[PDB]
């Protein structure tokens, strides 16, 4: 039942419920439910790296209570 956090540029904090197997595309689908940003307009960054829609959270060692950064495009 793992939680992660997404911070927008103006400091909003979105809490997501994810599994380490979830893909980044999944995470954007969850963010869309909460914020109303279509997945194609979302950039997610973690530890400096842009995250790719095909990889999973585990593929990036993103664990419980990690913070991802959300920027638009
Ligand atoms: Mg899931
Ligand atoms: Mg599952
Ligand atoms: Zn995509």
PDB file of N, CA, C and O and ligand atoms in Angstrom:
ATOM      1  N   UNK A   1       0.807  -1.222   0.000  1.00  0.00           N
ATOM      2  CA  UNK A   1       0.000   0.000   0.000  1.00  0.00           C
ATOM      3  C   UNK A   1       0.846   1.282   0.000  1.00  0.00           C
ATOM      4  O   UNK A   1       0.626   2.169   0.841  1.00  0.00           O
ATOM      5  N   UNK A   2       1.732   1.413  -0.994  1.00  0.00           N
ATOM      6  CA  UNK A   2       2.818   2.394  -0.957  1.00  0.00           C
ATOM      7  C   UNK A   2       2.378   3.778  -1.439  1.00  0.00           C
ATOM      8  O   UNK A   2       1.742   3.915  -2.487  1.00  0.00           O
ATOM      9  N   UNK A   3       2.748   4.804  -0.682  1.00  0.00           N
ATOM     10  CA  UNK A   3       2.461   6.193  -1.018  1.00  0.00           C
ATOM     11  C   UNK A   3       3.675   6.851  -1.658  1.00  0.00           C
ATOM     12  O   UNK A   3       4.811   6.588  -1.260  1.00  0.00           O
ATOM     13  N   UNK A   4       3.437   7.720  -2.639  1.00  0.00           N
ATOM     14  CA  UNK A   4       4.465   8.633  -3.111  1.00  0.00           C
ATOM     15  C   UNK A   4       3.865  10.036  -3.178  1.00  0.00           C
ATOM     16  O   UNK A   4       2.663  10.229  -3.003  1.00  0.00           O
ATOM     17  N   UNK A   5       4.730  11.022  -3.418  1.00  0.00           N
ATOM     18  CA  UNK A   5       4.336  12.423  -3.431  1.00  0.00           C
ATOM     19  C   UNK A   5       4.827  13.111  -4.692  1.00  0.00           C
ATOM     20  O   UNK A   5       5.952  12.877  -5.139  1.00  0.00           O
ATOM     21  N   UNK A   6       3.982  13.959  -5.263  1.00  0.00           N
ATOM     22  CA  UNK A   6       4.320  14.754  -6.434  1.00  0.00           C
ATOM     23  C   UNK A   6       4.167  16.224  -6.062  1.00  0.00           C
ATOM     24  O   UNK A   6       3.107  16.630  -5.579  1.00  0.00           O
ATOM     25  N   UNK A   7       5.224  17.013  -6.282  1.00  0.00           N
ATOM     26  CA  UNK A   7       5.236  18.443  -5.999  1.00  0.00           C
ATOM     27  C   UNK A   7       5.171  19.224  -7.309  1.00  0.00           C
ATOM     28  O   UNK A   7       5.993  19.007  -8.203  1.00  0.00           O
ATOM     29  N   UNK A   8       4.191  20.124  -7.426  1.00  0.00           N
ATOM     30  CA  UNK A   8       4.122  21.034  -8.563  1.00  0.00           C
ATOM     31  C   UNK A   8       5.053  22.218  -8.326  1.00  0.00           C
ATOM     32  O   UNK A   8       5.579  22.418  -7.231  1.00  0.00           O
ATOM     33  N   UNK A   9       5.272  23.008  -9.377  1.00  0.00           N
ATOM     34  CA  UNK A   9       6.259  24.083  -9.290  1.00  0.00           C
ATOM     35  C   UNK A   9       5.898  25.093  -8.208  1.00  0.00           C
ATOM     36  O   UNK A   9       6.785  25.639  -7.535  1.00  0.00           O
ATOM     37  N   UNK A  10       4.608  25.365  -8.025  1.00  0.00           N
ATOM     38  CA  UNK A  10       4.190  26.311  -7.008  1.00  0.00           C
ATOM     39  C   UNK A  10       3.986  25.654  -5.651  1.00  0.00           C
ATOM     40  O   UNK A  10       3.390  26.261  -4.754  1.00  0.00           O
ATOM     41  N   UNK A  11       4.479  24.431  -5.480  1.00  0.00           N
ATOM     42  CA  UNK A  11       4.572  23.811  -4.182  1.00  0.00           C
ATOM     43  C   UNK A  11       3.394  22.977  -3.742  1.00  0.00           C
ATOM     44  O   UNK A  11       3.368  22.546  -2.583  1.00  0.00           O
ATOM     45  N   UNK A  12       2.415  22.742  -4.607  1.00  0.00           N
ATOM     46  CA  UNK A  12       1.341  21.822  -4.261  1.00  0.00           C
ATOM     47  C   UNK A  12       1.898  20.417  -4.116  1.00  0.00           C
ATOM     48  O   UNK A  12       2.862  20.039  -4.786  1.00  0.00           O
ATOM     49  N   UNK A  13       1.282  19.632  -3.237  1.00  0.00           N
ATOM     50  CA  UNK A  13       1.756  18.285  -2.931  1.00  0.00           C
ATOM     51  C   UNK A  13       0.618  17.289  -3.138  1.00  0.00           C
ATOM     52  O   UNK A  13      -0.357  17.285  -2.387  1.00  0.00           O
ATOM     53  N   UNK A  14       0.744  16.447  -4.155  1.00  0.00           N
ATOM     54  CA  UNK A  14      -0.240  15.422  -4.480  1.00  0.00           C
ATOM     55  C   UNK A  14       0.227  14.106  -3.880  1.00  0.00           C
ATOM     56  O   UNK A  14       1.388  13.724  -4.049  1.00  0.00           O
ATOM     57  N   UNK A  15      -0.662  13.417  -3.179  1.00  0.00           N
ATOM     58  CA  UNK A  15      -0.367  12.099  -2.632  1.00  0.00           C
ATOM     59  C   UNK A  15      -0.953  11.026  -3.543  1.00  0.00           C
ATOM     60  O   UNK A  15      -2.155  11.047  -3.829  1.00  0.00           O
ATOM     61  N   UNK A  16      -0.111  10.099  -4.002  1.00  0.00           N
ATOM     62  CA  UNK A  16      -0.562   9.003  -4.847  1.00  0.00           C
ATOM     63  C   UNK A  16      -0.382   7.654  -4.151  1.00  0.00           C
ATOM     64  O   UNK A  16       0.557   7.452  -3.371  1.00  0.00           O
ATOM     65  N   UNK A  17      -1.301   6.730  -4.449  1.00  0.00           N
ATOM     66  CA  UNK A  17      -1.235   5.344  -3.988  1.00  0.00           C
ATOM     67  C   UNK A  17      -0.763   4.488  -5.161  1.00  0.00           C
ATOM     68  O   UNK A  17      -1.470   4.360  -6.163  1.00  0.00           O
ATOM     69  N   UNK A  18       0.437   3.925  -5.045  1.00  0.00           N
ATOM     70  CA  UNK A  18       1.098   3.207  -6.124  1.00  0.00           C
ATOM     71  C   UNK A  18       1.702   1.906  -5.594  1.00  0.00           C
ATOM     72  O   UNK A  18       1.930   1.738  -4.393  1.00  0.00           O
ATOM     73  N   UNK A  19       1.966   0.956  -6.541  1.00  0.00           N
ATOM     74  CA  UNK A  19       2.788  -0.244  -6.424  1.00  0.00           C
ATOM     75  C   UNK A  19       4.111  -0.011  -7.146  1.00  0.00           C
ATOM     76  O   UNK A  19       4.168   0.762  -8.109  1.00  0.00           O
ATOM     77  N   UNK A  20       5.212  -0.638  -6.725  1.00  0.00           N
ATOM     78  CA  UNK A  20       6.485  -0.423  -7.437  1.00  0.00           C
ATOM     79  C   UNK A  20       6.453  -0.923  -8.870  1.00  0.00           C
ATOM     80  O   UNK A  20       7.312  -0.535  -9.679  1.00  0.00           O
ATOM     81  N   UNK A  21       5.483  -1.770  -9.209  1.00  0.00           N
ATOM     82  CA  UNK A  21       5.305  -2.258 -10.568  1.00  0.00           C
ATOM     83  C   UNK A  21       4.575  -1.270 -11.474  1.00  0.00           C
ATOM     84  O   UNK A  21       4.577  -1.472 -12.695  1.00  0.00           O
ATOM     85  N   UNK A  22       3.947  -0.226 -10.920  1.00  0.00           N
ATOM     86  CA  UNK A  22       3.196   0.707 -11.747  1.00  0.00           C
ATOM     87  C   UNK A  22       4.141   1.405 -12.721  1.00  0.00           C
ATOM     88  O   UNK A  22       5.279   1.738 -12.373  1.00  0.00           O
ATOM     89  N   UNK A  23       3.687   1.588 -13.960  1.00  0.00           N
ATOM     90  CA  UNK A  23       4.468   2.353 -14.922  1.00  0.00           C
ATOM     91  C   UNK A  23       4.287   3.852 -14.687  1.00  0.00           C
ATOM     92  O   UNK A  23       3.365   4.298 -14.000  1.00  0.00           O
ATOM     93  N   UNK A  24       5.194   4.632 -15.271  1.00  0.00           N
ATOM     94  CA  UNK A  24       5.100   6.086 -15.178  1.00  0.00           C
ATOM     95  C   UNK A  24       3.812   6.579 -15.818  1.00  0.00           C
ATOM     96  O   UNK A  24       3.143   7.477 -15.285  1.00  0.00           O
ATOM     97  N   UNK A  25       3.444   6.001 -16.974  1.00  0.00           N
ATOM     98  CA  UNK A  25       2.168   6.314 -17.617  1.00  0.00           C
ATOM     99  C   UNK A  25       1.003   6.123 -16.650  1.00  0.00           C
ATOM    100  O   UNK A  25       0.079   6.939 -16.610  1.00  0.00           O
ATOM    101  N   UNK A  26       1.036   5.043 -15.868  1.00  0.00           N
ATOM    102  CA  UNK A  26       0.050   4.827 -14.815  1.00  0.00           C
ATOM    103  C   UNK A  26       0.031   5.979 -13.830  1.00  0.00           C
ATOM    104  O   UNK A  26      -1.036   6.461 -13.433  1.00  0.00           O
ATOM    105  N   UNK A  27       1.219   6.384 -13.372  1.00  0.00           N
ATOM    106  CA  UNK A  27       1.323   7.453 -12.393  1.00  0.00           C
ATOM    107  C   UNK A  27       0.712   8.728 -12.951  1.00  0.00           C
ATOM    108  O   UNK A  27      -0.063   9.411 -12.269  1.00  0.00           O
ATOM    109  N   UNK A  28       0.981   9.027 -14.227  1.00  0.00           N
ATOM    110  CA  UNK A  28       0.350  10.193 -14.835  1.00  0.00           C
ATOM    111  C   UNK A  28      -1.163  10.035 -14.928  1.00  0.00           C
ATOM    112  O   UNK A  28      -1.901  11.022 -14.824  1.00  0.00           O
ATOM    113  N   UNK A  29      -1.650   8.809 -15.106  1.00  0.00           N
ATOM    114  CA  UNK A  29      -3.092   8.616 -15.136  1.00  0.00           C
ATOM    115  C   UNK A  29      -3.684   8.884 -13.763  1.00  0.00           C
ATOM    116  O   UNK A  29      -4.783   9.443 -13.647  1.00  0.00           O
ATOM    117  N   UNK A  30      -2.943   8.526 -12.714  1.00  0.00           N
ATOM    118  CA  UNK A  30      -3.400   8.804 -11.355  1.00  0.00           C
ATOM    119  C   UNK A  30      -3.362  10.297 -11.067  1.00  0.00           C
ATOM    120  O   UNK A  30      -4.331  10.853 -10.535  1.00  0.00           O
ATOM    121  N   UNK A  31      -2.265  10.965 -11.451  1.00  0.00           N
ATOM    122  CA  UNK A  31      -2.178  12.419 -11.345  1.00  0.00           C
ATOM    123  C   UNK A  31      -3.297  13.103 -12.122  1.00  0.00           C
ATOM    124  O   UNK A  31      -3.830  14.127 -11.675  1.00  0.00           O
ATOM    125  N   UNK A  32      -3.647  12.593 -13.309  1.00  0.00           N
ATOM    126  CA  UNK A  32      -4.740  13.221 -14.052  1.00  0.00           C
ATOM    127  C   UNK A  32      -6.050  13.182 -13.255  1.00  0.00           C
ATOM    128  O   UNK A  32      -6.783  14.177 -13.191  1.00  0.00           O
ATOM    129  N   UNK A  33      -6.345  12.049 -12.611  1.00  0.00           N
ATOM    130  CA  UNK A  33      -7.558  11.942 -11.803  1.00  0.00           C
ATOM    131  C   UNK A  33      -7.609  13.008 -10.732  1.00  0.00           C
ATOM    132  O   UNK A  33      -8.683  13.549 -10.432  1.00  0.00           O
ATOM    133  N   UNK A  34      -6.456  13.322 -10.142  1.00  0.00           N
ATOM    134  CA  UNK A  34      -6.388  14.253  -9.029  1.00  0.00           C
ATOM    135  C   UNK A  34      -6.237  15.697  -9.471  1.00  0.00           C
ATOM    136  O   UNK A  34      -6.785  16.581  -8.811  1.00  0.00           O
ATOM    137  N   UNK A  35      -5.539  15.975 -10.578  1.00  0.00           N
ATOM    138  CA  UNK A  35      -5.267  17.356 -10.978  1.00  0.00           C
ATOM    139  C   UNK A  35      -5.895  17.777 -12.294  1.00  0.00           C
ATOM    140  O   UNK A  35      -5.947  18.975 -12.571  1.00  0.00           O
ATOM    141  N   UNK A  36      -6.335  16.844 -13.130  1.00  0.00           N
ATOM    142  CA  UNK A  36      -6.903  17.240 -14.401  1.00  0.00           C
ATOM    143  C   UNK A  36      -5.893  17.712 -15.426  1.00  0.00           C
ATOM    144  O   UNK A  36      -6.235  18.528 -16.283  1.00  0.00           O
ATOM    145  N   UNK A  37      -4.654  17.241 -15.363  1.00  0.00           N
ATOM    146  CA  UNK A  37      -3.677  17.475 -16.419  1.00  0.00           C
ATOM    147  C   UNK A  37      -3.609  16.212 -17.272  1.00  0.00           C
ATOM    148  O   UNK A  37      -3.248  15.146 -16.744  1.00  0.00           O
ATOM    149  N   UNK A  38      -3.948  16.273 -18.555  1.00  0.00           N
ATOM    150  CA  UNK A  38      -3.823  15.091 -19.429  1.00  0.00           C
ATOM    151  C   UNK A  38      -2.419  14.515 -19.370  1.00  0.00           C
ATOM    152  O   UNK A  38      -1.437  15.264 -19.267  1.00  0.00           O
ATOM    153  N   UNK A  39      -2.292  13.183 -19.406  1.00  0.00           N
ATOM    154  CA  UNK A  39      -0.960  12.575 -19.250  1.00  0.00           C
ATOM    155  C   UNK A  39       0.054  13.058 -20.270  1.00  0.00           C
ATOM    156  O   UNK A  39       1.252  13.060 -19.979  1.00  0.00           O
ATOM    157  N   UNK A  40      -0.367  13.463 -21.461  1.00  0.00           N
ATOM    158  CA  UNK A  40       0.641  13.848 -22.438  1.00  0.00           C
ATOM    159  C   UNK A  40       1.281  15.184 -22.098  1.00  0.00           C
ATOM    160  O   UNK A  40       2.375  15.467 -22.589  1.00  0.00           O
ATOM    161  N   UNK A  41       0.664  15.977 -21.225  1.00  0.00           N
ATOM    162  CA  UNK A  41       1.183  17.283 -20.854  1.00  0.00           C
ATOM    163  C   UNK A  41       1.989  17.266 -19.559  1.00  0.00           C
ATOM    164  O   UNK A  41       2.365  18.334 -19.066  1.00  0.00           O
ATOM    165  N   UNK A  42       2.298  16.089 -19.025  1.00  0.00           N
ATOM    166  CA  UNK A  42       2.966  15.950 -17.739  1.00  0.00           C
ATOM    167  C   UNK A  42       4.404  15.503 -17.931  1.00  0.00           C
ATOM    168  O   UNK A  42       4.659  14.499 -18.602  1.00  0.00           O
ATOM    169  N   UNK A  43       5.333  16.211 -17.293  1.00  0.00           N
ATOM    170  CA  UNK A  43       6.709  15.753 -17.171  1.00  0.00           C
ATOM    171  C   UNK A  43       6.964  15.432 -15.709  1.00  0.00           C
ATOM    172  O   UNK A  43       6.681  16.258 -14.836  1.00  0.00           O
ATOM    173  N   UNK A  44       7.452  14.225 -15.440  1.00  0.00           N
ATOM    174  CA  UNK A  44       7.804  13.797 -14.092  1.00  0.00           C
ATOM    175  C   UNK A  44       9.319  13.655 -13.985  1.00  0.00           C
ATOM    176  O   UNK A  44       9.948  13.014 -14.835  1.00  0.00           O
ATOM    177  N   UNK A  45       9.905  14.240 -12.939  1.00  0.00           N
ATOM    178  CA  UNK A  45      11.350  14.204 -12.726  1.00  0.00           C
ATOM    179  C   UNK A  45      11.621  13.681 -11.327  1.00  0.00           C
ATOM    180  O   UNK A  45      10.910  14.039 -10.382  1.00  0.00           O
ATOM    181  N   UNK A  46      12.629  12.814 -11.197  1.00  0.00           N
ATOM    182  CA  UNK A  46      13.043  12.273  -9.897  1.00  0.00           C
ATOM    183  C   UNK A  46      14.556  12.123  -9.878  1.00  0.00           C
ATOM    184  O   UNK A  46      15.125  11.495 -10.779  1.00  0.00           O
ATOM    185  N   UNK A  47      15.199  12.698  -8.857  1.00  0.00           N
ATOM    186  CA  UNK A  47      16.662  12.715  -8.750  1.00  0.00           C
ATOM    187  C   UNK A  47      17.312  13.177 -10.053  1.00  0.00           C
ATOM    188  O   UNK A  47      18.209  12.528 -10.591  1.00  0.00           O
ATOM    189  N   UNK A  48      16.834  14.309 -10.575  1.00  0.00           N
ATOM    190  CA  UNK A  48      17.407  14.932 -11.753  1.00  0.00           C
ATOM    191  C   UNK A  48      16.980  14.358 -13.087  1.00  0.00           C
ATOM    192  O   UNK A  48      17.047  15.075 -14.097  1.00  0.00           O
ATOM    193  N   UNK A  49      16.531  13.096 -13.131  1.00  0.00           N
ATOM    194  CA  UNK A  49      16.207  12.417 -14.385  1.00  0.00           C
ATOM    195  C   UNK A  49      14.732  12.570 -14.752  1.00  0.00           C
ATOM    196  O   UNK A  49      13.848  12.347 -13.922  1.00  0.00           O
ATOM    197  N   UNK A  50      14.477  12.960 -15.999  1.00  0.00           N
ATOM    198  CA  UNK A  50      13.151  12.832 -16.595  1.00  0.00           C
ATOM    199  C   UNK A  50      12.738  11.371 -16.631  1.00  0.00           C
ATOM    200  O   UNK A  50      13.503  10.514 -17.081  1.00  0.00           O
ATOM    201  N   UNK A  51      11.524  11.081 -16.175  1.00  0.00           N
ATOM    202  CA  UNK A  51      11.057   9.705 -16.125  1.00  0.00           C
ATOM    203  C   UNK A  51      10.314   9.347 -17.400  1.00  0.00           C
ATOM    204  O   UNK A  51       9.553  10.154 -17.931  1.00  0.00           O
ATOM    205  N   UNK A  52      10.551   8.131 -17.890  1.00  0.00           N
ATOM    206  CA  UNK A  52      10.025   7.699 -19.179  1.00  0.00           C
ATOM    207  C   UNK A  52       8.751   6.904 -18.975  1.00  0.00           C
ATOM    208  O   UNK A  52       8.676   6.050 -18.087  1.00  0.00           O
ATOM    209  N   UNK A  53       7.761   7.167 -19.827  1.00  0.00           N
ATOM    210  CA  UNK A  53       6.424   6.619 -19.613  1.00  0.00           C
ATOM    211  C   UNK A  53       6.409   5.101 -19.606  1.00  0.00           C
ATOM    212  O   UNK A  53       5.562   4.503 -18.934  1.00  0.00           O
ATOM    213  N   UNK A  54       7.345   4.459 -20.319  1.00  0.00           N
ATOM    214  CA  UNK A  54       7.367   3.005 -20.373  1.00  0.00           C
ATOM    215  C   UNK A  54       8.011   2.315 -19.181  1.00  0.00           C
ATOM    216  O   UNK A  54       7.750   1.128 -18.952  1.00  0.00           O
ATOM    217  N   UNK A  55       8.852   3.011 -18.421  1.00  0.00           N
ATOM    218  CA  UNK A  55       9.492   2.350 -17.300  1.00  0.00           C
ATOM    219  C   UNK A  55       8.549   2.303 -16.096  1.00  0.00           C
ATOM    220  O   UNK A  55       7.506   2.960 -16.049  1.00  0.00           O
ATOM    221  N   UNK A  56       8.925   1.504 -15.110  1.00  0.00           N
ATOM    222  CA  UNK A  56       8.164   1.402 -13.879  1.00  0.00           C
ATOM    223  C   UNK A  56       8.820   2.227 -12.783  1.00  0.00           C
ATOM    224  O   UNK A  56       9.924   2.766 -12.937  1.00  0.00           O
ATOM    225  N   UNK A  57       8.112   2.321 -11.653  1.00  0.00           N
ATOM    226  CA  UNK A  57       8.679   2.985 -10.486  1.00  0.00           C
ATOM    227  C   UNK A  57       9.892   2.218  -9.984  1.00  0.00           C
ATOM    228  O   UNK A  57      10.957   2.806  -9.752  1.00  0.00           O
ATOM    229  N   UNK A  58       9.759   0.891  -9.848  1.00  0.00           N
ATOM    230  CA  UNK A  58      10.901   0.089  -9.412  1.00  0.00           C
ATOM    231  C   UNK A  58      12.097   0.286 -10.333  1.00  0.00           C
ATOM    232  O   UNK A  58      13.221   0.462  -9.855  1.00  0.00           O
ATOM    233  N   UNK A  59      11.871   0.354 -11.649  1.00  0.00           N
ATOM    234  CA  UNK A  59      12.946   0.648 -12.601  1.00  0.00           C
ATOM    235  C   UNK A  59      13.724   1.920 -12.252  1.00  0.00           C
ATOM    236  O   UNK A  59      14.741   2.220 -12.885  1.00  0.00           O
ATOM    237  N   UNK A  60      13.242   2.708 -11.290  1.00  0.00           N
ATOM    238  CA  UNK A  60      13.910   3.942 -10.881  1.00  0.00           C
ATOM    239  C   UNK A  60      14.206   3.963  -9.384  1.00  0.00           C
ATOM    240  O   UNK A  60      14.604   5.006  -8.848  1.00  0.00           O
ATOM    241  N   UNK A  61      14.012   2.835  -8.702  1.00  0.00           N
ATOM    242  CA  UNK A  61      14.204   2.714  -7.257  1.00  0.00           C
ATOM    243  C   UNK A  61      13.397   3.753  -6.495  1.00  0.00           C
ATOM    244  O   UNK A  61      13.765   4.164  -5.394  1.00  0.00           O
ATOM    245  N   UNK A  62      12.277   4.177  -7.071  1.00  0.00           N
ATOM    246  CA  UNK A  62      11.342   5.042  -6.365  1.00  0.00           C
ATOM    247  C   UNK A  62      10.614   4.212  -5.317  1.00  0.00           C
ATOM    248  O   UNK A  62       9.956   3.218  -5.641  1.00  0.00           O
ATOM    249  N   UNK A  63      10.738   4.604  -4.053  1.00  0.00           N
ATOM    250  CA  UNK A  63      10.190   3.821  -2.947  1.00  0.00           C
ATOM    251  C   UNK A  63       9.186   4.643  -2.137  1.00  0.00           C
ATOM    252  O   UNK A  63       8.873   5.788  -2.471  1.00  0.00           O
ATOM    253  N   UNK A  64       8.699   4.037  -1.052  1.00  0.00           N
ATOM    254  CA  UNK A  64       7.697   4.654  -0.191  1.00  0.00           C
ATOM    255  C   UNK A  64       8.083   6.080   0.177  1.00  0.00           C
ATOM    256  O   UNK A  64       9.186   6.333   0.667  1.00  0.00           O
ATOM    257  N   UNK A  65       7.167   7.012  -0.089  1.00  0.00           N
ATOM    258  CA  UNK A  65       7.263   8.421   0.288  1.00  0.00           C
ATOM    259  C   UNK A  65       8.325   9.183  -0.493  1.00  0.00           C
ATOM    260  O   UNK A  65       8.708  10.276  -0.088  1.00  0.00           O
ATOM    261  N   UNK A  66       8.805   8.643  -1.613  1.00  0.00           N
ATOM    262  CA  UNK A  66       9.592   9.440  -2.545  1.00  0.00           C
ATOM    263  C   UNK A  66       8.793  10.651  -3.016  1.00  0.00           C
ATOM    264  O   UNK A  66       7.555  10.663  -2.997  1.00  0.00           O
ATOM    265  N   UNK A  67       9.510  11.676  -3.469  1.00  0.00           N
ATOM    266  CA  UNK A  67       8.872  12.864  -4.013  1.00  0.00           C
ATOM    267  C   UNK A  67       9.281  13.043  -5.463  1.00  0.00           C
ATOM    268  O   UNK A  67      10.468  13.230  -5.758  1.00  0.00           O
ATOM    269  N   UNK A  68       8.303  12.997  -6.363  1.00  0.00           N
ATOM    270  CA  UNK A  68       8.522  13.302  -7.770  1.00  0.00           C
ATOM    271  C   UNK A  68       8.140  14.752  -8.014  1.00  0.00           C
ATOM    272  O   UNK A  68       7.376  15.352  -7.249  1.00  0.00           O
ATOM    273  N   UNK A  69       8.697  15.323  -9.078  1.00  0.00           N
ATOM    274  CA  UNK A  69       8.465  16.721  -9.410  1.00  0.00           C
ATOM    275  C   UNK A  69       7.700  16.787 -10.728  1.00  0.00           C
ATOM    276  O   UNK A  69       8.053  16.109 -11.698  1.00  0.00           O
ATOM    277  N   UNK A  70       6.628  17.569 -10.749  1.00  0.00           N
ATOM    278  CA  UNK A  70       5.733  17.633 -11.891  1.00  0.00           C
ATOM    279  C   UNK A  70       5.891  18.971 -12.587  1.00  0.00           C
ATOM    280  O   UNK A  70       5.777  20.027 -11.952  1.00  0.00           O
ATOM    281  N   UNK A  71       6.162  18.926 -13.885  1.00  0.00           N
ATOM    282  CA  UNK A  71       6.203  20.121 -14.702  1.00  0.00           C
ATOM    283  C   UNK A  71       5.427  19.822 -15.974  1.00  0.00           C
ATOM    284  O   UNK A  71       5.258  18.666 -16.369  1.00  0.00           O
ATOM    285  N   UNK A  72       4.945  20.883 -16.600  1.00  0.00           N
ATOM    286  CA  UNK A  72       4.057  20.779 -17.743  1.00  0.00           C
ATOM    287  C   UNK A  72       4.828  20.830 -19.066  1.00  0.00           C
ATOM    288  O   UNK A  72       6.045  21.032 -19.106  1.00  0.00           O
ATOM    289  N   UNK A  73       4.086  20.638 -20.160  1.00  0.00           N
ATOM    290  CA  UNK A  73       4.623  20.693 -21.519  1.00  0.00           C
ATOM    291  C   UNK A  73       3.499  20.613 -22.544  1.00  0.00           C
ATOM    292  O   UNK A  73       3.758  20.474 -23.744  1.00  0.00           O
TER     293      UNK A  73
HETATM  294 MG1  LIG B   1      -2.184   0.177  -9.574  1.00  0.00          MG
HETATM  295 MG1  LIG B   2      -1.450  -4.581  -8.289  1.00  0.00          MG
HETATM  296 ZN1  LIG B   3       2.926   8.670 -22.366  1.00  0.00          ZN
END
